[PDB]
Amino acid sequence: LWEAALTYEASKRRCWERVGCPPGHREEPYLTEAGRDAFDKFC
Amino acid sequence: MIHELLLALSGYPGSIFTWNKRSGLQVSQDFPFLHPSETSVLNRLCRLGTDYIRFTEFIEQYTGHVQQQDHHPSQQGQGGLHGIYLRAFCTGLDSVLQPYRQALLDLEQEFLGDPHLSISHVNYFLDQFQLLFPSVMVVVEQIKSQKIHGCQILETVYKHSCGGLPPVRSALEKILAVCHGVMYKQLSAWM
Amino acid sequence: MIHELLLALSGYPGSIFTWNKRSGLQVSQDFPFLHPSETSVLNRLCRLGTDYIRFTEFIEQYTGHVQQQDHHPSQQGQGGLHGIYLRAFCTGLDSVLQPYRQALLDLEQEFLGDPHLSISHVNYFLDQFQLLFPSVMVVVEQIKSQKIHGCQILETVYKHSCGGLPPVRSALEKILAVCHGVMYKQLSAWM
Amino acid sequence: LAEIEKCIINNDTTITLAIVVDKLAPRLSQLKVLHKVFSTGVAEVPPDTRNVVRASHLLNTLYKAILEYDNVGEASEQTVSLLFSLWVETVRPYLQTVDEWIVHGHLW
Amino acid sequence: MATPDQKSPNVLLQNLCCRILGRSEADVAQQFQYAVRVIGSNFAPTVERDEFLVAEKIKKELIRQRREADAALFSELHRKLHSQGVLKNKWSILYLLLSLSEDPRRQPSKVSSYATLFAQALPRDAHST
Amino acid sequence: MATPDQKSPNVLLQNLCCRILGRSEADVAQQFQYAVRVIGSNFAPTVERDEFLVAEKIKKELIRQRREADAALFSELHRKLHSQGVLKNKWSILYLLLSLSEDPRRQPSKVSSYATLFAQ
Amino acid sequence: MATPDQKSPNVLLQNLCCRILGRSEADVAQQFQYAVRVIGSNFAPTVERDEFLVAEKIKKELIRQRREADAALFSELHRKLHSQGVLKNKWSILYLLLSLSEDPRRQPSKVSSYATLFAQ
Amino acid sequence: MASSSGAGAAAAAAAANLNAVRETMDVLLEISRILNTGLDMETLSICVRLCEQGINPEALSSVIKELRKATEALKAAENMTS
Amino acid sequence: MASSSGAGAAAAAAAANLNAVRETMDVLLEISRILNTGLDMETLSICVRLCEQGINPEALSSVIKELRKATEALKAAENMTS
Amino acid sequence: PDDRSWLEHHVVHQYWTARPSQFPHSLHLHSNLAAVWDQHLYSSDPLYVPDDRVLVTETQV
């Protein structure tokens, strides 16, 4: 089970604001750029 | 919003991009979800959209109406843009917006392919039209303001054809070619 | 802190690493999060960082400034760095610092990768440049002091190119190759 | 800049300001050279100078800059290309006027 | 979506045999039985749970293979492993890796002598397991 | 025709307190109580109840801040607002806007952290 | 963000009460509470938030008190302080000092011992 | 809304643990490669699980050696029969 | 020579800060004397810290006046009851 | 506004808006270098008044 879990890939994104888990946290763009659903929510 | 922005550029003003008869298409207000630099980029895009809207308004004003068979066609030329050259001018404007429409459609397709695209990609892609449209709009506004009539408008276009912008030069060449085709038809009839 | 240290090594002095026009880059103050022995080691590395900063300052002084169009271009080489040989010298210096910049970026990435890495790892990794840079800095200071001009600069570099440090030898070989390329271009024009 | 923004948007990899600065270093250098050249060719031109005089000063500046960048060698290759394209574009109206004079005998 | 959980020795041995032999468990039944018999009565109270001894042995082996740089790399890897709190029986893992290690020199194609020294390790037997 | 549920001034004030504090209405209860106490208090009449006089006072105040361009802009915006005719209580809104103006030139007398002691 | 190990506002207020009363902090508890109440009370904005205006007001007050030499000394000290740039809140300190200036000719109105009568 | 923050954080912690285990296994594989141990990712993972599962390190080492000898004998038999 | 640059600069900055604080306190004392404020060095330092923390000079003056009146009343009461 | 606020929290914080977006960051010395510098400065000069600093994200920067 540990070895099936071993085959998990994780994000290479790191930041120098985070040190305890630098696995990325997906900045998640905003200003238009979050796509149609966010634009509809904004509208 | 990107689709909304294109619709505003396609002539559909919304709540963010308001169309004003005096100001044209404009961003209605500063929104909290954009960085003020993003607000500035949006305002530049709204400037481009305003120019496009004004162009569309002119196109409708001189081409969008069926030609009234007023018995004296010569007097139609005075107040309203009229004349075969005026129709050719409107046709040239629509043809020049046709490549712009194609670029807008390509942008729409790209935005449909990638929902994560930002305004910077559009600003890169649309910068050529952001430079083209102001000059053609200035030329058209000058034609309207000076009441250039008949083939004398063609002379102004030639003067404008001497512009430094290669793309503006080519566009004015296309419009001039259409007007010259009409002129040549009249000249053929005369000769 | 490591990011701040790299920024100082990248030429952005901060509150920890102060730049002094006379002393160069220096640690500004004792930090409460460093052992005084760790502070001493960090400042020992900061000596190399200061040399790098001074090299970058020289690079700006000799490539970053517009060549004054003094009518006699030969005399432009004396006071201000000017001349094709001066441009080649600045280009060689920047090329030699490019590998150092790359090593600094790789170090920054590695330190971002592992929060358990210490400054000792950087001091180990950067020791090759801590040995390389001082000799090139001495050579550049000598070039500046002797006001070597034109191809006479090339002769001095050749004399210095004969150094005993293999890494310095290789770097001077690269610089000499660039200078010989410029010389060969001039020789081609003449021949 | 758009390619960098796209890479940032993908967010898959840690992109740092230092990495971006290093990526832009050649472009930043080209921008600095262009800024200096532009300042000398245009910004250094007095505002009350005749358009002909402004143009002639710019042209002489272009020629001198071309000589400088040709002497700058391979390291200026991108800058040399930029300057050559700039020279071709700036001569385009001048070359057009020359062509019109030579072909039609009329200086327009 | 697998969560680490204690699985019976039989499952682990079956999977290990399948991957090592590259055959179905039916084709390794004799070998599986032999291994099961040997393994089933083997508890190590004599093994000293000390990573330092294993690391020293690895360093000495690398030096013997003229791989001092590789020894330093191994030390750094061990340091990183210690930084991570994933493994609890690091001494066991290191012992297993060293025992299953095959010398690339045995670089070359053979190893010079095998004069095993009394150096070795601790016997831990002193405790009442 | 069901005029959008403009929640009663008490609910609106609670929402405003929550919005201003950036906390939920439940987290702004002390601030909500302070707001309720202020709102229930008898307030003096606004300094100016004339739309044009209030607009002129706003323009004068902007000029006093050496914002003459802003004073002209304020007078123009006031003219535009008067012509738009959307606001029913022009004098009250103008007085409010005048009361809410801040001088960018006057270095903020940084409110000592001690004021927070009484907020609880 | 260079936050000097500023002993808490409570400790400073207690020390101030003890210093003013000439009693220990434990003996100035009522005075400490009064100080905390006063600081916690909403105060009208200070008369002057301009360092130079506060200095000029102090000079004018000293001149009105026929302390022209003291007015000149105050103006000079204010100029020196402004050039020194050591004080972070020059306007607040200058306003405080001006407000705290005392005319030596006007006999200090000795707070009658009678105030203690109501404390019991 | 409260409850969802815990499960997401737990899942993130599990994923981070998985990534850390993967990194550790990669480090171990690299160590084996430098040491030329000849273990594959699946075999290495199985061995890691077994050691994590409490196998006696003297027993585990002896078992691993015996299993490796048996695997080599089986591979030699397969190559001799082919 | 390399190691010394941080601690030496820190020490020089500390000495300069001490001299500046002394100079500032002297200037403040002179200003207070011209204004007849009555503040001592310790009181001046406390006031400086309070002003640096943002206290409203009108609020600070009102608080000071009330504290001074209470202190004067307490001293007068102690002298009247003795 | 609740769904919009949830998106606004998840679509990247309004830090680009003058509204202070407080974001969680690691307190590790290498990750809290700004905070560690603030602590040292706060510890070192009794005359030091802490200026108001806006925390910005590296990606945002």
XYZ file of all heavy atoms in Angstrom, chain D, unseen atoms left out:
537
model
N 7.585 38.065 -22.738
C 6.858 38.328 -21.503
C 5.618 37.450 -21.403
O 5.312 36.910 -20.334
C 6.480 39.808 -21.425
N 4.903 37.281 -22.515
C 3.726 36.424 -22.536
C 4.102 34.969 -22.315
O 3.361 34.226 -21.668
C 2.976 36.594 -23.857
N 5.242 34.539 -22.854
C 5.665 33.161 -22.628
C 6.006 32.934 -21.163
O 5.661 31.895 -20.585
C 6.863 32.830 -23.514
N 6.648 33.919 -20.539
C 6.939 33.833 -19.114
C 5.645 33.788 -18.320
O 5.504 33.011 -17.368
C 7.829 35.010 -18.683
N 4.682 34.628 -18.697
C 3.400 34.645 -18.008
C 2.687 33.310 -18.151
O 2.068 32.826 -17.202
C 2.533 35.780 -18.551
N 2.732 32.722 -19.345
C 2.152 31.401 -19.555
C 2.807 30.365 -18.656
O 2.119 29.543 -18.034
C 2.291 31.000 -21.022
N 4.138 30.393 -18.566
C 4.823 29.447 -17.698
C 4.435 29.661 -16.246
O 4.322 28.698 -15.479
C 6.335 29.581 -17.868
N 4.213 30.915 -15.858
C 3.759 31.210 -14.505
C 2.354 30.670 -14.297
O 2.031 30.107 -13.244
C 3.829 32.723 -14.241
N 1.501 30.826 -15.309
C 0.113 30.397 -15.217
C 0.031 28.890 -15.063
O -0.826 28.374 -14.336
C -0.676 30.883 -16.446
N 0.904 28.154 -15.755
C 0.863 26.703 -15.618
C 1.142 26.278 -14.184
O 0.662 25.229 -13.743
C 1.868 26.057 -16.570
N 1.913 27.076 -13.446
C 2.194 26.905 -12.022
C 2.765 25.536 -11.673
O 2.835 25.184 -10.488
C 0.939 27.166 -11.176
N 3.173 24.745 -12.666
C 3.673 23.407 -12.374
C 5.049 23.441 -11.721
O 5.382 22.550 -10.931
C 3.710 22.576 -13.656
N 5.850 24.455 -12.026
C 7.232 24.530 -11.581
C 7.491 25.833 -10.839
O 6.899 26.872 -11.144
C 8.204 24.415 -12.760
N 8.380 25.760 -9.854
C 8.796 26.936 -9.099
C 9.578 27.886 -9.999
O 10.692 27.574 -10.429
C 9.648 26.521 -7.905
N 8.993 29.044 -10.290
C 9.649 30.107 -11.042
C 9.942 31.228 -10.055
O 9.022 31.756 -9.419
C 8.782 30.602 -12.207
N 11.211 31.598 -9.923
C 11.565 32.676 -9.015
C 11.920 33.943 -9.775
O 12.207 33.924 -10.974
C 12.746 32.274 -8.125
N 11.893 35.055 -9.038
C 12.221 36.344 -9.629
C 13.625 36.325 -10.204
O 13.886 36.926 -11.250
C 12.075 37.452 -8.591
N 14.551 35.659 -9.516
C 15.905 35.538 -10.036
C 15.903 34.787 -11.357
O 16.617 35.161 -12.294
C 16.800 34.837 -9.019
N 15.115 33.716 -11.445
C 15.059 32.941 -12.678
C 14.533 33.807 -13.809
O 15.060 33.790 -14.929
C 14.195 31.683 -12.478
N 13.498 34.595 -13.526
C 12.922 35.460 -14.545
C 13.927 36.521 -14.963
O 14.068 36.831 -16.151
C 11.618 36.089 -14.025
N 14.632 37.098 -13.992
C 15.622 38.123 -14.291
C 16.719 37.549 -15.168
O 17.180 38.194 -16.116
C 16.191 38.708 -12.986
N 17.146 36.325 -14.876
C 18.187 35.712 -15.688
C 17.681 35.440 -17.095
O 18.404 35.656 -18.074
C 18.667 34.421 -15.031
N 16.439 34.974 -17.213
C 15.859 34.746 -18.530
C 15.771 36.038 -19.332
O 15.998 36.041 -20.547
C 14.477 34.117 -18.382
N 15.464 37.146 -18.666
C 15.328 38.436 -19.327
C 16.639 39.191 -19.460
O 16.657 40.259 -20.082
C 14.323 39.304 -18.567
N 17.724 38.671 -18.895
C 18.994 39.389 -18.919
C 19.417 39.802 -20.320
O 19.800 40.968 -20.502
C 20.072 38.522 -18.256
N 19.392 38.931 -21.328
C 19.733 39.406 -22.678
C 18.744 40.429 -23.190
O 19.139 41.448 -23.773
C 19.717 38.122 -23.514
N 17.453 40.186 -22.973
C 16.449 41.158 -23.373
C 16.591 42.446 -22.579
O 16.403 43.537 -23.121
C 15.052 40.570 -23.199
N 16.919 42.339 -21.290
C 17.113 43.541 -20.486
C 18.310 44.342 -20.972
O 18.273 45.576 -21.000
C 17.284 43.166 -19.015
N 19.379 43.656 -21.368
C 20.537 44.343 -21.919
C 20.196 45.008 -23.241
O 20.604 46.149 -23.496
C 21.691 43.361 -22.095
N 19.457 44.304 -24.096
C 19.029 44.899 -25.351
C 18.171 46.122 -25.085
O 18.304 47.143 -25.763
C 18.265 43.872 -26.185
N 17.285 46.029 -24.096
C 16.454 47.163 -23.727
C 17.290 48.326 -23.221
O 17.002 49.482 -23.532
C 15.444 46.734 -22.664
N 18.331 48.046 -22.438
C 19.185 49.123 -21.953
C 19.925 49.800 -23.097
O 20.004 51.036 -23.156
C 20.174 48.580 -20.924
N 20.452 49.006 -24.026
C 21.157 49.573 -25.169
C 20.200 50.397 -26.012
O 20.518 51.510 -26.444
C 21.822 48.461 -25.997
N 19.018 49.845 -26.275
C 18.009 50.562 -27.037
C 17.612 51.849 -26.338
O 17.412 52.873 -26.989
C 16.792 49.668 -27.257
N 17.458 51.805 -25.015
C 17.103 53.002 -24.267
C 18.167 54.072 -24.415
O 17.852 55.245 -24.635
C 16.891 52.653 -22.794
N 19.436 53.685 -24.314
C 20.496 54.675 -24.453
C 20.525 55.234 -25.867
O 20.629 56.452 -26.065
C 21.842 54.054 -24.090
N 20.393 54.354 -26.860
C 20.419 54.782 -28.252
C 19.249 55.707 -28.538
O 19.400 56.731 -29.208
C 20.412 53.556 -29.183
N 18.066 55.352 -28.043
C 16.883 56.167 -28.260
C 17.025 57.510 -27.571
O 16.646 58.543 -28.128
C 15.644 55.432 -27.757
N 17.569 57.516 -26.354
C 17.754 58.774 -25.654
C 18.678 59.679 -26.447
O 18.385 60.864 -26.637
C 18.314 58.521 -24.257
N 19.759 59.116 -26.984
C 20.695 59.931 -27.744
C 20.089 60.390 -29.064
O 20.290 61.535 -29.481
C 21.981 59.147 -27.996
N 19.331 59.517 -29.731
C 18.836 59.845 -31.053
C 17.639 60.765 -31.041
O 17.463 61.564 -31.966
N 16.808 60.678 -30.005
C 15.547 61.402 -29.930
C 15.498 62.285 -28.693
O 15.210 63.482 -28.782
C 14.343 60.435 -29.954
N 15.766 61.707 -27.521
C 15.592 62.465 -26.294
C 16.619 63.581 -26.213
O 16.335 64.651 -25.664
C 15.693 61.548 -25.078
N 17.810 63.349 -26.760
C 18.850 64.364 -26.785
C 18.600 65.421 -27.849
O 19.302 66.438 -27.869
C 20.212 63.709 -27.016
N 17.621 65.209 -28.721
C 17.271 66.157 -29.776
C 16.449 67.290 -29.173
O 15.410 67.032 -28.545
C 16.513 65.466 -30.919
N 16.878 68.541 -29.313
C 16.106 69.664 -28.764
C 14.715 69.724 -29.366
O 14.532 69.475 -30.568
C 16.938 70.893 -29.162
N 13.706 70.053 -28.556
C 12.323 70.045 -29.061
C 12.062 71.037 -30.180
O 11.238 70.758 -31.060
C 11.499 70.380 -27.813
N 12.735 72.184 -30.182
C 12.472 73.198 -31.193
C 13.194 72.935 -32.504
O 13.120 73.772 -33.410
C 12.865 74.579 -30.663
N 13.882 71.805 -32.631
C 14.584 71.508 -33.868
C 13.585 71.222 -34.978
O 12.521 70.639 -34.744
C 15.513 70.309 -33.683
N 13.922 71.653 -36.187
C 13.064 71.379 -37.327
C 12.977 69.878 -37.559
O 13.920 69.130 -37.281
C 13.597 72.077 -38.578
N 11.814 69.434 -38.041
C 11.615 68.008 -38.274
C 12.712 67.459 -39.173
O 13.204 66.347 -38.960
C 10.238 67.759 -38.890
N 13.103 68.233 -40.187
C 14.260 67.873 -41.000
C 15.507 67.775 -40.133
O 16.305 66.843 -40.273
C 14.450 68.890 -42.139
N 15.698 68.738 -39.229
C 16.899 68.741 -38.403
C 16.859 67.589 -37.413
O 17.872 66.916 -37.179
C 17.049 70.094 -37.687
N 15.694 67.343 -36.814
C 15.552 66.202 -35.920
C 15.877 64.913 -36.657
O 16.608 64.055 -36.152
C 14.137 66.161 -35.346
N 15.336 64.769 -37.868
C 15.571 63.571 -38.662
C 17.046 63.414 -38.998
O 17.587 62.309 -38.930
C 14.729 63.618 -39.934
N 17.704 64.501 -39.403
C 19.115 64.416 -39.762
C 19.962 64.051 -38.552
O 20.906 63.258 -38.658
C 19.580 65.739 -40.369
N 19.622 64.601 -37.386
C 20.355 64.260 -36.176
C 20.150 62.796 -35.836
O 21.098 62.092 -35.475
C 19.908 65.151 -35.018
N 18.913 62.324 -35.965
C 18.616 60.920 -35.733
C 19.397 60.036 -36.692
O 19.922 58.997 -36.298
C 17.115 60.677 -35.876
N 19.426 60.404 -37.973
C 20.140 59.607 -38.965
C 21.628 59.544 -38.659
O 22.250 58.482 -38.771
C 19.906 60.185 -40.360
N 22.222 60.675 -38.279
C 23.635 60.657 -37.930
C 23.863 59.813 -36.687
O 24.846 59.065 -36.598
C 24.143 62.080 -37.719
N 22.937 59.898 -35.731
C 23.023 59.080 -34.533
C 22.927 57.610 -34.893
O 23.642 56.778 -34.333
C 21.917 59.468 -33.553
N 22.019 57.273 -35.803
C 21.876 55.903 -36.269
C 23.163 55.409 -36.905
O 23.599 54.286 -36.649
C 20.717 55.812 -37.260
N 23.767 56.222 -37.769
C 25.012 55.806 -38.403
C 26.099 55.562 -37.363
O 26.804 54.543 -37.407
C 25.460 56.859 -39.415
N 26.227 56.474 -36.397
C 27.260 56.322 -35.380
C 26.984 55.120 -34.488
O 27.903 54.377 -34.129
C 27.362 57.595 -34.544
N 25.720 54.919 -34.120
C 25.332 53.753 -33.341
C 25.612 52.474 -34.104
O 26.023 51.471 -33.518
C 23.854 53.844 -32.969
N 25.338 52.476 -35.407
C 25.618 51.312 -36.235
C 27.101 50.997 -36.185
O 27.507 49.841 -36.033
C 25.139 51.552 -37.677
N 27.932 52.029 -36.320
C 29.370 51.815 -36.232
C 29.753 51.263 -34.864
O 30.553 50.323 -34.762
C 30.108 53.123 -36.510
N 29.158 51.813 -33.805
C 29.461 51.368 -32.450
C 29.081 49.910 -32.249
O 29.846 49.135 -31.668
C 28.735 52.253 -31.437
N 27.901 49.520 -32.719
C 27.434 48.159 -32.505
C 28.184 47.178 -33.390
O 28.400 46.029 -32.991
C 25.932 48.072 -32.764
N 28.592 47.607 -34.587
C 29.413 46.743 -35.423
C 30.760 46.515 -34.765
O 31.308 45.408 -34.814
C 29.585 47.359 -36.811
N 31.306 47.561 -34.145
C 32.532 47.407 -33.382
C 32.307 46.622 -32.099
O 33.271 46.095 -31.533
C 33.117 48.780 -33.056
N 31.061 46.532 -31.623
C 30.812 45.818 -30.378
C 30.910 44.309 -30.555
O 31.086 43.586 -29.568
C 29.434 46.212 -29.812
N 30.795 43.809 -31.782
C 31.028 42.401 -32.040
C 29.853 41.491 -31.720
O 28.692 41.906 -31.605
N 30.189 40.202 -31.596
C 29.184 39.144 -31.507
C 28.226 39.379 -30.347
O 27.037 39.050 -30.437
C 29.866 37.783 -31.371
N 28.731 39.929 -29.239
C 27.907 40.106 -28.049
C 26.730 41.029 -28.317
O 25.741 40.991 -27.577
C 28.753 40.648 -26.898
N 26.814 41.845 -29.363
C 25.760 42.771 -29.738
C 24.929 42.234 -30.889
O 24.160 42.990 -31.489
C 26.355 44.132 -30.108
N 25.101 40.953 -31.230
C 24.465 40.384 -32.414
C 22.972 40.677 -32.427
O 22.421 41.097 -33.447
C 24.720 38.880 -32.471
N 22.291 40.420 -31.310
C 20.872 40.747 -31.236
C 20.667 42.250 -31.357
O 19.771 42.714 -32.075
C 20.276 40.223 -29.931
N 21.538 43.026 -30.711
C 21.448 44.477 -30.803
C 21.823 44.943 -32.198
O 21.230 45.891 -32.721
C 22.348 45.132 -29.757
N 22.826 44.310 -32.803
C 23.222 44.684 -34.155
C 22.077 44.417 -35.121
O 21.798 45.222 -36.016
C 24.499 43.929 -34.567
N 21.414 43.273 -34.969
C 20.245 42.964 -35.780
C 19.151 43.997 -35.584
O 18.528 44.458 -36.550
C 19.719 41.583 -35.404
N 18.885 44.352 -34.328
C 17.892 45.376 -34.046
C 18.239 46.681 -34.743
O 17.390 47.300 -35.389
C 17.778 45.586 -32.537
N 19.490 47.119 -34.611
C 19.908 48.372 -35.225
C 19.834 48.310 -36.742
O 19.478 49.295 -37.390
C 21.323 48.724 -34.774
N 20.182 47.168 -37.331
C 20.105 47.050 -38.781
C 18.664 47.117 -39.259
O 18.362 47.788 -40.254
C 20.776 45.757 -39.231
N 17.761 46.432 -38.557
C 16.346 46.521 -38.892
C 15.838 47.944 -38.720
O 15.073 48.447 -39.551
C 15.544 45.553 -38.025
N 16.269 48.607 -37.649
C 15.881 49.989 -37.412
C 16.380 50.886 -38.531
O 15.662 51.780 -38.987
C 16.423 50.455 -36.063
N 17.609 50.658 -38.983
C 18.175 51.473 -40.045
C 17.399 51.262 -41.329
O 17.088 52.221 -42.041
C 19.650 51.130 -40.242
N 17.092 50.005 -41.644
C 16.329 49.714 -42.848
C 14.971 50.397 -42.785
O 14.532 51.029 -43.753
C 16.189 48.193 -43.033
N 14.301 50.313 -41.634
C 12.989 50.936 -41.497
C 13.074 52.452 -41.603
O 12.224 53.085 -42.240
C 12.359 50.532 -40.166
N 14.093 53.052 -40.992
C 14.202 54.503 -41.012
C 14.562 55.002 -42.400
O 14.125 56.084 -42.808
C 15.243 54.966 -39.996
N 15.331 54.211 -43.146
C 15.683 54.590 -44.502
C 14.526 54.328 -45.437
O 14.444 54.959 -46.495
C 16.932 53.836 -44.981
N 13.617 53.431 -45.057
C 12.483 53.107 -45.915
C 11.752 54.357 -46.364
O 11.501 54.493 -47.569
C 11.545 52.139 -45.182
N 11.366 55.281 -45.482
C 10.767 56.517 -46.001
C 11.782 57.335 -46.773
O 11.460 57.895 -47.829
C 10.285 57.233 -44.734
N 13.022 57.395 -46.283
C 14.055 58.143 -46.986
C 14.381 57.489 -48.320
O 14.518 58.173 -49.340
C 15.305 58.253 -46.119
N 14.523 56.162 -48.324
C 14.788 55.449 -49.567
C 13.622 55.587 -50.527
O 13.816 55.672 -51.740
C 15.070 53.974 -49.284
N 12.400 55.595 -50.003
C 11.232 55.822 -50.842
C 11.277 57.200 -51.482
O 10.975 57.349 -52.670
C 9.958 55.652 -50.017
N 11.636 58.222 -50.706
C 11.737 59.564 -51.268
C 12.831 59.629 -52.324
O 12.653 60.242 -53.387
C 12.005 60.581 -50.158
N 13.956 58.962 -52.066
C 15.035 58.912 -53.046
C 14.568 58.213 -54.312
O 14.858 58.656 -55.429
C 16.266 58.217 -52.439
N 13.861 57.096 -54.156
C 13.352 56.359 -55.303
C 12.394 57.213 -56.114
O 12.443 57.213 -57.347
C 12.665 55.077 -54.835
N 11.484 57.915 -55.439
C 10.535 58.769 -56.141
C 11.252 59.874 -56.902
O 10.887 60.194 -58.038
C 9.534 59.362 -55.152
N 12.302 60.440 -56.305
C 13.054 61.480 -56.997
C 13.795 60.914 -58.199
O 13.853 61.550 -59.256
C 14.031 62.149 -56.033
N 14.376 59.725 -58.052
C 15.157 59.149 -59.137
C 14.252 58.693 -60.272
O 14.606 58.808 -61.450
C 16.025 57.994 -58.607
N 13.092 58.132 -59.943
C 12.252 57.530 -60.969
C 11.364 58.576 -61.620
O 11.254 58.644 -62.850
C 11.422 56.383 -60.365
N 10.725 59.419 -60.811
C 9.783 60.399 -61.318
C 10.389 61.783 -61.473
O 9.718 62.677 -61.998
C 8.563 60.482 -60.393
N 11.627 61.983 -61.036
C 12.213 63.300 -61.136
C 11.568 64.336 -60.251
O 11.850 65.526 -60.407
N 10.712 63.924 -59.320
C 9.987 64.842 -58.452
C 10.290 64.499 -57.004
O 10.056 63.367 -56.568
C 8.481 64.775 -58.717
N 10.815 65.473 -56.268
C 11.059 65.324 -54.837
C 9.749 65.564 -54.099
O 9.335 66.708 -53.898
C 12.143 66.289 -54.375
N 9.086 64.483 -53.697
C 7.871 64.569 -52.892
C 8.272 64.483 -51.425
O 8.495 63.395 -50.890
C 6.890 63.467 -53.271
